[PDB]
Amino acid sequence: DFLLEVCSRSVNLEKASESLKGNMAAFLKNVCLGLEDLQYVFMISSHELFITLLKDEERKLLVDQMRKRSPRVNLCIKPVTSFYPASASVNIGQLEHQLILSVDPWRIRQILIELHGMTSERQFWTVSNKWEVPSVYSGVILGIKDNLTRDLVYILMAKGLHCSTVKDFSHAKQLFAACLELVTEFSPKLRQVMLNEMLLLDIHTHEAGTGQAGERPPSDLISRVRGYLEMRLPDIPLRQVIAEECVAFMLNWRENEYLTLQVPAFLLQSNPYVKLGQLLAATCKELPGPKESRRTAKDLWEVVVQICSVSSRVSLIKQRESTLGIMYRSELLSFIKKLREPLVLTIILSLFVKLHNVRDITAEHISIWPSSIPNLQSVDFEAVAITVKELVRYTLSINP
């Protein structure tokens, strides 16, 4: 308004000739053109001087072309539905279609209750094959005596996992919490399955939204991961991917003291993933030391080389079996592909570059791995070339 008052007090209209009128109009137009907030465009737009100089038809084109600079958009997000309930069958089908489109757990529970009431014994978990469940958990999820409870638990599981897939973790959290609170009454094994599923979903959520900018977890996710890594519970069915992401997160945030010292002894014998996490943590914490680092770099070397070895034409990629390693080659590649930490990534690149140098390529801490290897014939140099190519592509994806 100081600009516009100065403009008005200095223009001296009806005697300013055409040149000054045009130049003042241009200045006002182009001081609108750069305005980031349209309300200010509105300021000069309402001003009497603005209306006075230019014309009665370019002001409208100006205001509309500044409105389309940041247009407001309204769109229908709700799915189409040809709902119109005459017969029992049409009612059943329309309600099952809604069951498909429903993602809030309470609406699903309502539609499942009404369908089980209207029908006699038909299950409604199978009204869509696109609903998936891990096979280690299908057997337990089908052991509930109540049909409606089993159906609701299944549909909640499937919708929560598929939501976790599409990175819409709010819905997954809601659905999973509903299932967990519903299953606390009758089945402790299903409660433990739900606990692990919440743990994995929270880890995924943190690393998707809560991280991505370098903020510490609230330290209870770390405690939950720690408790999950020390269950010692044989009856509970487990997914190895939950443990894999536990170790991947745990090694993402440099907490190498626990994996090096506080890890239970039996876990290293049991889970190869925890063992690899410990080895990377130990070989990353000792980088300052020329000699102390070698004590862990040595077993990291041997573990990785027999990982890429072939026991007995045979190829590691073509067969994927006959390997001496405790960990699969593609599983090792995936486990690495959940690491975004730069120090561990460069350690791993030096590990596979030195391995690809024997039969050069230089990758930072390249003098830390030993040179002489046992069973040089057993390792697959073509497999290591493939693994190093994929590994370097992933590393140039994380930090381009």
Added chain:
Amino acid sequence: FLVDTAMPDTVREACDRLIQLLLLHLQKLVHHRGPPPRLVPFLDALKNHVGELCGETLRLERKRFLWQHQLLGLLSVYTRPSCGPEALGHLLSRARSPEELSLATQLYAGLVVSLSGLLPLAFRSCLARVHAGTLQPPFTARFLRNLALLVGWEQQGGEGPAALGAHFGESASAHLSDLAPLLLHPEEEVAEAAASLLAICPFPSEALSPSQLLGLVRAGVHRFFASLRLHGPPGVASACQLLTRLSQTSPAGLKAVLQLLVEGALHRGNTELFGGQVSRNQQEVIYNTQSLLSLLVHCCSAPGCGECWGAPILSPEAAKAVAVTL
């Protein structure tokens, strides 16, 4: 024929009941027995016509469009190559109004409960068609501006994008390299559509590759300079926003954009816009120079009430780089 004969009123109602019960039955089939998949010969003759199918649904008539849309949802859920991305790409690159484009959001909302990764494949597929001779330029422009509307609508987060939950911005960001050559594409409408997508489309979360960063920067300055040569100060904001967004990326990108903007300003091209020697109106020269110098000040000035009249401090290093380039 059936849809034409659902719109003798008794025969109309007969066809209407037929198509509704047929949709109920197909929906039971495509989604059941959760074992080899069932076969629906009816749908298996439709995958060749899914694109044609989309066209009918995009006519947005009174009642046929609803049936066709549920048909597309069912077909997509059925087809093992998951034709859902193909349907979404057709809806995106064919819609012409916000209401038609609402169909694509409706379709994805119906899909995301059964299908996953449809935005990456839809774009990975749409931009793949783009890098070829198909998808005549108006169609690609329609796809690009519908994507621009999608990312803008998602950015102004309310209840809509909160519930749809697409991540349009990310799933268009991972294709910034594929969008970049289009800013050199000859026909102006595709170029501006790509630029206006880019200005608002977020850069990848990790970083921009030096090849990506530099190609984006060159494309942005070319758009900015060409945007200006044809539109002038009003029509460059897109590029400018992008350039400014590029110039705050990192000191490498800042120095690259400042050096390339200063060099392109002083090349034998982009010199007659600023009174360069080898008659032109002066007024346009002052205001072209206004846009270029405002961009430079935006790129140069430090981002981020500091009193009501104060002004942001120009950084020393940006002016140092402008100095050495000069």
